[PDB]
């Protein structure tokens, strides 16, 4: 469960992400594809080369969804409903992969938010991404 | 994968000799598709997978199960060289089929449940332990050429 | 989320377990210790020899908790509140280990319930154990 | 276990030359205890672990952190024989300490986070990938003698 301090941490850190959210979403995917090559099996239709516009575009979508989640932190399941439907019924990404992206998002934030990426903030962000992951995988079976 | 003691090897070979490969193959693949429905993503060309009954009775599922467990079966003769034995298959699953190796682990656990259901009390804790090592071994061998 | 059909499946299978719950809980532990030796790291204070009173007693307590959960499948969080506190604050078992015991409980049920361990029941029990695991890990952070 | 392309190797080595083991070690262990609090079960004798500030400022956490990363640094020097290198410590962690090897994986991930935090833009996607391989290697080496 996200405590009030968790919610404050998340909104503050994401606040600072601001306009770079899209750039960071792409970087996180890039990190994921290089570090955990099995994740590439879900994007056989993409050009996964460094700088790919497909990765950049997808990065923006992932980022926008996370912004939406931050904005609706008290009402995540409803806000992410269509996305939970999509992952469960069409994309069908193994639940294990969510932990890999989550880690990569964390690494990306750490690399860009020296000041804000405190141990307390790190913990809150990890809890937040696990909550998002839980919701997205909620309707798998 | 870990250490198969000649005893642990023998316990594997002995039970396997009693397996109806085609039957267990169909059952394990069908149960994978029912228990972890996301795995159905590769099989939309197999037709009707709407219910447990439809899955378990689907001839394409049964036929794919037979193919998969037949290769597994052949691997049991090469416990000493799984990586070599599964290299080309590893490559194919990565490069052409795009199958997340996590599916091999899921199948391995479903297979263990199937054997347990099939063998009852003969599937003892030590026998399970040996098969756990084999299923993890096979999964590792199939994921080895991923890049 | 457990569907109403899931709930029916679980109550049916558990009903059949009946009075053997405790012997089954012990066998599941022995299966876990043998197949996943890393789980022994949480029991250095136990005599883990086959049929030890410690394992049999522990297997009984595990089975009782499961029975409690089946009885209160609509309100698991509340029913297991005390156990979730114990696991989060005292035992502190890494969450990965819940998946290993759940797998061994599944194998145990499969080996003892030939007639009842149908694909649909298997799926329902898998989800049920995942839900129990989630509730027990709920208060970790 | 670690398969490193020459480039990934020199990448690893170059970054490690700039790490203050003392400082990064204390950071990595403290963050582990904060982010995954259940890991505190091995350090009951370390003092106050009650809040992030208590954890991060604990001298025993700082001391232990240094010890662990120093042993970790030695592995960097024997990337080709991680198992031989860590055998003794593997046994110690199993037999005397009773540490679930899953903890090695959590620490490896926290370490990556710490390096990214410390080095910023220099910790590029390819560099991270090389470190992920190393960390997995190390954790595997440490879990090797478990029984
Ligand atoms: C924080 C976790 C995640 C979030 C918020 C997220 C969000 C999204 C969004 C917003 C879309 C676009 C949907 C649309 O086109 O309307 C999408 C699609 C997709 N996602 Fe997820 N995702 C997450 C995790 C994952 C993971 C871990 C994988 C696999 C490794 C994955 C694989 C895909 C794929 C293959 C698509 C379709 C992309 C395309 O065809 O362009 N996602 N996701
Ligand atoms: C023990 C694990 C497995 C073994 C030994 C195995 C083996 C095989 C073999 C021998 C083939 C035929 C290759 C050929 O065309 O020459 C095959 C194809 C295939 N496998 Fe695997 N497999 C395993 C697990 C899986 C899993 C878990 C999935 C997905 C859930 C999967 C998905 C596929 C698919 C989609 C094909 C192509 C089928 C077709 O074109 O008709 N396999 N596999
Ligand atoms: C289905 C999941 C589980 C359930 C329902 C469960 C339930 C219980 C119960 C009822 C107790 C006894 C509480 C008491 O004495 O009042 C207990 C204790 C304990 N459990 Fe859990 N458990 C589960 C998973 C695990 C796992 C996966 C592990 C480690 C691999 C574990 C390790 C322990 C330990 C070490 C104790 C302390 C027992 C002693 O010192 O006698 N548990 N658990
Ligand atoms: C990078 C992986 C790790 C390495 C290389 C490592 C190395 C070491 C070394 C060199 C020691 C000193 C042994 C001695 O007393 O002679 C030690 C002790 C210890 N380690 Fe590990 N460690 C690692 C990860 C961990 C993790 C993740 C944990 C648990 C979270 C852990 C728990 C301990 C404990 C409890 C001790 C005993 C300290 C004491 O006596 O108070 N270690 N480790």
Q: Please indicate if any CB of chain A lies within 8 Å of the CB of C123.
A: yes
User: Is the CB of D29 within 6 Å of ligand 4?
Assistant: no
Q: How far is the CA of A38 from the centre of ligand 2 (A)?
A: 16
Number of domains in chain B: 1
For a substitution probing ligand 4, which of D19, D24, D35, D68 has the most ligand atoms within 8 Å of its CB? Answer: D68
A60 vs A40: CA distance, rounded Å? 18
- Conformational region of residue A124, where left means phi above 0, alpha means psi within -120 to 50, and beta covers everything else: alpha
D142 vs D140: CA distance, rounded Å? 5
Query: How long a stretch of residues is chain A?
Result: 141
Q: 3-state class of B147 per DSSP? A: coil
B63 vs B43: CA distance, rounded Å? 12
Instruction: Report CA-CA distances (Å) from D101 to C37, C38, D46, D140.
Output: 11, 7, 21, 8
| C44 chain-D contacts, CB cut-off 8 A | 98
Q: 3-state class of B49 per DSSP? A: coil
**Residue A113 near residue A16 (C-beta atoms within 8 A):** yes
- Structure tokens given for D7: 């480039």
Residues 6 or more apart whose CB falls under 8 angstroms from that of A73 comprise A2, A7, A10, A11, A128
| Ligand closest in space to the Cα of D33 | 4
- Structure tokens given for B101: 């190796």
Identify the closest residue of chain C to B112 by CA–CA distance: C107
**Residue D115 near residue D24 (C-beta atoms within 8 A):** yes
DSSP line for C49-108: STT-HHHHHHHHHHHHHHHHHHHTTTSHHHHTHHHHHHIIIII---THHHHHHHHHHHHH
Place of tokens 């499946």: C9
For residue D111, the tally of other CB atoms under 10 A from its CB is 24
Closest Cβ–Cβ partner in C1, C127, C141 for A127 = C141
User: Among D38, D5, D14, D20, which residue's Cα sits nearest to residue D130?
Assistant: D5
| Ligand closest in space to the Cα of A40 | 1
Q: How far is the CA of C70 from the centre of ligand 3 (A)?
A: 17
Place of tokens 């199939």: B142
DSSP line for C111-123: HH-TTT--HHHHH
**CATH number for the domain that contains residue C138:** 1.10.490.10
Instruction: Report CA-CA distances (Å) from D29 to C125, D44, D60, D109.
Output: 38, 14, 11, 11
Structural domain range at position A103: 1-141
Q: What angle do CA C81, A98, C93 make, to 5 degrees?
A: 35
Interface chains of chain A (3 or more CB pairs under 8 Å) = B, C, D
C123 vs A141: CA distance, rounded Å? 9
| C92 chain-D contacts, CB cut-off 8 A | 37-41
Closest Cβ–Cβ partner in A37, A92, A97 for B41 = A92
**Residue A122 near residue D30 (C-beta atoms within 8 A):** no
Q: What is the distance in angstroms between the Cα of B11 and the nearest Cα belonging to chain A?
A: 32
- Structure tokens given for C136: 């027990």
Considering only CA atoms, give the Rg of chain A.
Answer: 14
Q: Could you say which DSSP state residue B1 is in?
A: -
User: Among D64, B122, A96, which residue's Cα sits nearest to residue C114?
Assistant: B122
Q: 3-state class of B75 per DSSP? A: helix
**CATH number for the domain that contains residue D20:** 1.10.490.10
- Structure tokens given for B134: 């084999």
Instruction: Report CA-CA distances (Å) from B49 to A101, B65, B102, B104, C93.
Output: 30, 15, 21, 20, 38
Structural domain range at position D100: 1-147
D128 vs D37: CA distance, rounded Å? 25
Method of structure determination: X-ray
Number of domains in chain A: 1
Q: Please indicate if any CB of chain C lies within 8 Å of the CB of A123.
A: yes
């Amino acid at each position: 469960v996200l405590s009030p301090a968790d919610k404050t941490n998340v909104k503050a850190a994401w606040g600072k992400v601001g306009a770079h959210a899209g750039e960071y979403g792409a970087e996180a995917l890039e990190r994921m594809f290089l570090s955990f090559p099995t994740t590439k099996t879900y994007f056989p239709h993409f050009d996964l080369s460094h700088g790919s516009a497909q990765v950049k575009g997808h990065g923006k979508k992932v980022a926008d969804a996370l912004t939406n989640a931050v904005a609706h932190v008290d009402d995540m399941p409803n806000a992410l409903s269509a996305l939970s439907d999509l992952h469960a019924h069409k994309l069908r990404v193994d639940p294990v992969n969510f932990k890999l992206l989550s880690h990569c998002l964390l690494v990306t934030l750490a690399a860009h938010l020296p000041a804000e990426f405190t141990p307390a903030v790190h913990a809150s962000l990890d809890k937040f991404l696990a909550s998002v992951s839980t919701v997205l995988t909620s309707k798998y079976r | 994968m870990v250490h198969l003691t000649p005893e642990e090897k023998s316990a594997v070979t002995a039970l396997w000799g009693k397996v109806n490969v085609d039957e267990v193959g169909g059952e394990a693949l069908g149960r994978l598709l029912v228990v972890y429905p996301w795995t159905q993503r590769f099989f939309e060309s197999f037709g009707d997978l709407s219910t447990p009954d439809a899955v378990m009775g689907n001839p394409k599922v049964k036929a794919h199960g037979k193919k998969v467990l037949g290769a597994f079966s052949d691997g049991l003769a090469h416990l000493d060289n799984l990586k070599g034995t599964f290299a080309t298959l590893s490559e194919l699953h990565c490069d052409k089929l795009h199958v997340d190796p996590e599916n091999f682990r899921l199948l391995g656990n479903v297979l263990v449940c199937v054997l347990a259901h099939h063998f009852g009390k003969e599937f003892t804790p030590p026998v399970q332990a040996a098969y756990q090592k084999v299923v993890a071994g096979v999964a590792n061998a199939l994921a080895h050429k991923y890049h």
